[PDB]
Amino acid sequence: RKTSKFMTKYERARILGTRALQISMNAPVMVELEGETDPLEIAMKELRQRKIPFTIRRYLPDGSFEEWGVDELIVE
């Protein structure tokens, strides 16, 4: 709660990088990709299909944190 409920560019880039690193290490893809040979393309496809099993923990400056998920947040 008390959040913008919008995925920032930095968080999106970090998620894409982590997913690309995971896929580049021969990891199964949750989404079905046809004619895709680049891990970045598969990561972007998964992000567009919001099927990534990732959770975002936003650290508030006061010391507390709020748990979110990539499916709950929206991408502009």
Partner: protein
């Protein structure tokens, strides 16, 4: 005035020897809160990337 000790950043600004000597005499504790302090010790600054964390579940 803010009661925030940053010996490493002050030393990197100017006069590192005097700043380090004063910090050693006072026995202050550096929490590495600054971005440059984190970068010098191989840590992310945390402004754009690194402020949040990723958890599988």
């Amino acid at each position: 005035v803010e009661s925030t000790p940053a010996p490493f950043t002050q030393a990197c600004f100017s006069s590192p020897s005097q700043c380090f000597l004063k910090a050693a005499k006072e026995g202050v504790r550096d929490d590495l809160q600054g971005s440059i302090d984190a970068l010098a010790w191989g840590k992310v600054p945390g402004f754009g990337t690194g402020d949040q964390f990723e958890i599988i579940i």
